[PDB]
Amino acid sequence: TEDVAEVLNRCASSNWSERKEGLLGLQNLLKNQRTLSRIELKRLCEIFTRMFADPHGKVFSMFLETLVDFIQVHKDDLQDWLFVLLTQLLKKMGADLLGSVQAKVQKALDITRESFPNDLQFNILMRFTVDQTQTPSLKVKVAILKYIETLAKQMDPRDFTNSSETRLAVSRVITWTTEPKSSDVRKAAQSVLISLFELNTPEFTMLLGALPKTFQDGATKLLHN
C-alpha cells in the first residue's frame, strides 16, 4: 500500500485491476509527498509513457488524473521527459476521445504548460510540428496549434528565434492556414501566425524574409493589418 517499488509494480501490471490499484497507491504517495528516488522516477516515467496507450478506459482516465499531481510534484526533475509528456498529450488531445476524457487531457496539458520553461516547451513544439516519423490527423494539428497559440501568450519574445527548425515549422503552419478539409485548422494556424508575429515582430519579419515568395505573401495577406 505504501511501498514505492510495489506501487510501481502494480502500475506496470498487465492486469487492469492491478494498474487501477497501483494508480490509487501512487496518487496517495503523491498526496502524502512520499518522495521518489531518481531511478524510481525514471521507472515511473517509463510506466507512464506506456500508460498513454493503456487499453482500459478506467485505468487511462485515472492515469490522466494522476498526471496532474505527478507533474505538480516533480516538474523540476521532469525536463528530460517533457518531450514525451507533451507530444503524447497532444496526440491524445487530437484522438477525438469522449468529452469527459478530453477534459482530463486538456487539464493535463494546461498543467504541463504552466509547469515547464517556455523555451523548452516551444522547441519541442517546433520539432513536433515538422516531425517526419508520423503523419498527424487534422485534429492532432488543431491541438498542436491551439497549444502553440496559448504558449505564445505567456512566452518571452526571445523564446522565439529565427532558426532553421522554427523556419521549417512556420512554413508548415502557413499552408495549414489554407487547409480546405478543416476550418478549425484554418483558424488555429492563423491565430498561431498572428500570436508569433505579435510576440516578436522583428524576429518574425526576419523569418518571413528567409521564406520563398509563396509562404511570405500567404502570411502577408493574413498579417495585414
Rounded to whole angstroms, the Cα distance separating 127 from 21 reads 36
Residue 77 contacts residue 37 (beta carbons within 8 Å): no
Residue 197 contacts residue 153 (beta carbons within 8 Å): no
Q: Name every residue whose Cβ is closer than 8 Å to that of residue 50 and which is 6 or more positions away in sequence.
A: 12
CA distances from 165 to 123, 127, 203, 207 (A): 9, 7, 14, 11
Name the residue among 197, 198, 176 with its Cα closest to residue 187.
176
C-alpha cell at 2: 505504501
Rounded to whole angstroms, the Cα distance separating 71 from 85 reads 10
Q: Given the C-alpha cell 510576440, which residue does it identify?
A: 199
Q: Which amino acid is it at 47?
A: I
Rounded to whole angstroms, the Cα distance separating 183 from 54 reads 31
Quoted resolution (Å): 2.2
Residue 204 contacts residue 197 (beta carbons within 8 Å): yes
C-alpha cell at 147: 497549444
Rounded to whole angstroms, the Cα distance separating 38 from 53 reads 24
Report the CATH number of the 1-225 domain. Answer: 1.25.10.10
Name the residue among 194, 121, 207, 120 with its Cα closest to residue 161.
207
Residue 178 contacts residue 150 (beta carbons within 8 Å): no
Rounded to whole angstroms, the Cα distance separating 222 from 174 reads 10
To the nearest 10°, the Cα dihedral for 51, 56, 33, 103?
A: 90
C-alpha cell at 165: 527548425
Rounded to whole angstroms, the Cα distance separating 196 from 157 reads 9
Radius of gyration of the chain (CA): 19
| Elucidation technique | X-ray
**How would DSSP label each residue in 116-142?**
S-HHHHHHHHHHHHH-SSS---HHHHH
C-alpha cell at 18: 492491478
Q: Name every residue whose Cβ is closer than 8 Å to that of residue 138 and which is 6 or more positions away in sequence.
A: 179, 181, 182, 184, 185
Residue 210 contacts residue 162 (beta carbons within 8 Å): yes
Give the number of other Cβ atoms within 10 Å of residue 48's Cβ. 20
Residue 165 contacts residue 127 (beta carbons within 8 Å): yes
C-alpha cell at 208: 518571413
C-alpha cell at 50: 506506456
Q: Any idea how long the chain is?
A: 225
Name the residue among 3, 1, 22, 27 with its Cα closest to residue 11.
22
Q: Where are the domains of the chain?
A: 1-225
H or E stretch covering 202: helix 201-209
First and final C-alpha spacing in the chain = 60
Rounded to whole angstroms, the Cα distance separating 197 from 153 reads 11
